[PDB]
Design a binder for this molecule. Sequence first.
Ligand SMILES: C[C@@H](O)[C@H](N)C(=O)OC/C=C/Cn1cnc2cc(Br)c(Cl)cc2c1=O
Ligand SMILES: [Zn+2]
Ligand SMILES: [Zn+2]
Lengths: 401, 401
Amino acid sequence: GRDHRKIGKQLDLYHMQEEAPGMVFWHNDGWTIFRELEVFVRSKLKEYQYQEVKGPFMMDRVLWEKTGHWDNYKDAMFTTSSENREYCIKPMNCPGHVQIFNQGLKSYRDLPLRMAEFGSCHRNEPSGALHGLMRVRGFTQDDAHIFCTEEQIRDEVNACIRMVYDMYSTFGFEKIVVKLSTRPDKRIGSDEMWDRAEADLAVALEENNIPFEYQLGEGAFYGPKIEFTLYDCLDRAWQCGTVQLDFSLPSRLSASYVGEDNERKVPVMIHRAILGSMERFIGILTEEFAGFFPTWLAPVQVVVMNITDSQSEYVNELTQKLQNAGIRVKADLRNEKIGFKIREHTLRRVPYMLVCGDKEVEAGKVAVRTRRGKDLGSLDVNDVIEKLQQEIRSRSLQQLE
Amino acid sequence: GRDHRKIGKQLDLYHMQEEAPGMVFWHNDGWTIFRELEVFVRSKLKEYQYQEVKGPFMMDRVLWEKTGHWDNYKDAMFTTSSENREYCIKPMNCPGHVQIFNQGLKSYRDLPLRMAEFGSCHRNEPSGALHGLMRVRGFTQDDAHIFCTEEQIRDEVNACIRMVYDMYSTFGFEKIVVKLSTRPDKRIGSDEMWDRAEADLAVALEENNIPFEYQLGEGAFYGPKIEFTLYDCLDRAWQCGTVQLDFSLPSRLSASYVGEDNERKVPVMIHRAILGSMERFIGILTEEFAGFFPTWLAPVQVVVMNITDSQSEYVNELTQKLQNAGIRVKADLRNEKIGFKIREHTLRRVPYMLVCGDKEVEAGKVAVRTRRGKDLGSLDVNDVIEKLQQEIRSRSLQQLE
Ligand SMILES: C[C@@H](O)[C@H](N)C(=O)OC/C=C/Cn1cnc2cc(Br)c(Cl)cc2c1=O
Ligand SMILES: [Zn+2]
Ligand SMILES: [Zn+2]
């Protein structure tokens, strides 16, 4: 009952085809989940004071060659040509963000500059390694890059760490393992630069009261990182989050700002993603909930249904009210037994089934059944609407009484 | 002047650069506009009963050969390869939508099925023909495909036409010219199918009293199209909308549903895009308004400012209250003359400037000035918040009077 590929078919969320290896066809209901996840991340972007931008899908290979990634990663990049020029389909958003940073003179007053994007990335991953939503060729990162001074690093990493635990707690993930990857054998910068950079990550973690462990020698050539691994309800580990310091890319791409002493300074860059791949995170969630998505995420939140034809216009009014309240609602007005309707929508993991018999219509009430088979009895319509709105707005993991 | 390139730079909306010809980098404020336009389109998708999906970025050339796309467009497609297979970066969303349609058995009871996407598309346009946001290589099409029966064509084409005029009138575009583009020299489908399709589109225009001219030979290879051209305040013509009737691609991609009888039948497909390209439409709006976007589209909707440090706390509170009412708002507490502050936000095209002096703090009021220079008086805070909320939620073209 926790295979995201079977559940994804059963709930009509997505499909894959050999015509587009590792690129997801999002169906209506799956795209609803994705969009709702995007809304959630955007709420955190506002709360943590990020800009949100959007970069193009391709950029001249010439620019990618300047980044220092081209040699290590050419074989995993899609390329395409036009008019004697070769373009890379972007595998990451960082160089694009630096291009945005480079427009307009920046000063120290603009820092820290926090730049997020739901970045549509492609990697030419071997087809034999592809698997459902979790190993794909086309993915979307909840990405951001922070441009800051050396003095601002700790405070910026501190905020990233808070954002990580904040976001994972929303989905019920409270068991998190954290690993700090230290200086590799081949690296840029001085040993003193590495001492200070590793300490900044370590102290920011201490300032959040987070125990962690080292992954010795596993840092990037361009700086140390923290990785965050969450545990699902089956105690399976999923590495999702990354906070990566980068002392190389800004210099490579001629990024600079006017310092307070009026000299040209090169900013430090922090790369961070919390969920990682949105597609992969939806896979993880599907398995974690076994398809019983929390109401805020559920493609269809409520189905309103009549026992007989006599309650059809009451169901229509109630459905319009729920629609006006911002709820994802459908009316099931089929000439079918109420038990048939409940079973179908239970199998589809609809959080709430609002049942209207003659007694409900006559009292201006509605009978509420949950997808877990709980009869909550019959309740005043406006009180039920208010409770559903609260469960949705608060992104609650739990259903009503 | 109302050059979208200049306004785009001045208001920090977007940029373009030679490393990515005809591809847009949206900066924070431009991306806010884009996303509000998406919110608007999604409101119409809901109103007109469309699903929303997302297709893959690329698909195997083999599939594009089956549609007729390879024969009809290879020199304008970007291609890439992996593991000895060639992929086309999608120039259109229709084949992907049919792939989604083909998952799971469809019956007549599922039709009309209206499937929309903000489709990321790419066309390898000659670089010399590119200009601004109006002719680009990478774009986002407000696309949809309607799968319906032959009997449903008249109602579904009518609804598309209604949707076009509805959406254009939101932006104040009332001068619309219409052409019916008929069978091109290179095409698919029989002359009897083209007779039927062309006649269906002609009747729809006649029934709506839409005058039109035939545009001979300019149909799509798969079917005829109604083309909608809007006129801006300079009386320039911009072709934006298209409604196309297709009796050929569904058969080529093995689309079918079980009819009201029990026989296997091929659905009709209607293609339509209204804004055309999100990027181009933003370009057109930018010029139409000269950067004075209606409040609902404006990157920053309200700026709240003090006279002295005396009113700082009141201003921060009012700002929080506008933020709670859903308004894009910032506070300006700087130690600058009120005329300097007001000018700055007028230059940035902020719709409303809210000013708090001692008399305003005392009375629970706020002084409101519009970016055109009208002083609306000191007014009760909650009456202003309510009036702004209505202006925004109703997507009004005019500010308060
Ligand atoms: C958080 C982001 O802002 C950051 N840029 C990132 O992707 O970090 C997560 C992992 C990075 C490691 N990685 C993994 N796979 C790759 C595949 C390709 Br192709 C290229 Cl060019 C680079 C890489 C690459 O750095
Ligand atoms: Zn990055
Ligand atoms: Zn189409």
